[PDB]
Design a protein around this ligand. Structure first.
Ligand SMILES: CC1=C(/C=C/C(C)=C/C=C/C(C)=C/CO)C(C)(C)CCC1
Length: 139
């Protein structure tokens, strides 16, 4: 699988409960729930960049698959985790070790869809994005 591309959000299921389990404050949850971020992904060998792009703020991941790293979640819940993203067949599995139990996510492709299941403390949020071709500049 190659995740490289630009992807536009189609659905975002149960995001409020995911953010509440991360202790994101009420005012920021109100803002965040309205956002429909894009994903811009570049898979360059095992060097993976996943840019979560929104009109409010972006969240940038930039890591090596298979190598644990210190993930700085400033702008989300302002925690840090020891995070590992690994291949599991055609799926990408992420474990975010830290204060919250069961924190991580799974990402995969079906057809023209990027599927992303985010988890923390037994809460499940499911996002689906559609592959798109009209690009625009971002930071
Ligand atoms: C709460 C919050 C946000 C949440 C971002 C999230 C939850 C990003 C998850 C990224 C993953 C799981 C990438 C793998 O594709 C953004 C920054 C949009 C805007 C500010 C408030």
């Amino acid at each position: 699988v190659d995740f490289t591309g630009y992807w536009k959000m189609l659905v975002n299921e149960n995001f409020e409960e995911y953010l509440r389990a991360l202790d994101v404050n009420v005012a920021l949850r109100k803002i965040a729930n309205l956002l429909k971020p894009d994903k811009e992904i570049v898979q360059d060998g095992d060097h993976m960049i996943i840019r979560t792009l929104s009109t409010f703020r972006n969240y940038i991941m930039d890591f090596q698959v298979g190598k644990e790293f210190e993930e700085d979640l400033t702008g989300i819940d302002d925690r840090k985790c020891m995070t590992t993203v690994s291949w599991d067949g055609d799926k990408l599995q992420c474990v975010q070790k830290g204060e919250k139990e069961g924190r991580g996510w799974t990402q995969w492709i079906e057809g023209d869809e990027l599927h992303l299941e985010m988890r923390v403390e037994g809460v499940v949020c499911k996002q689906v994005f559609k592959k798109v071709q009209h690009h625009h500049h971002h930071h």
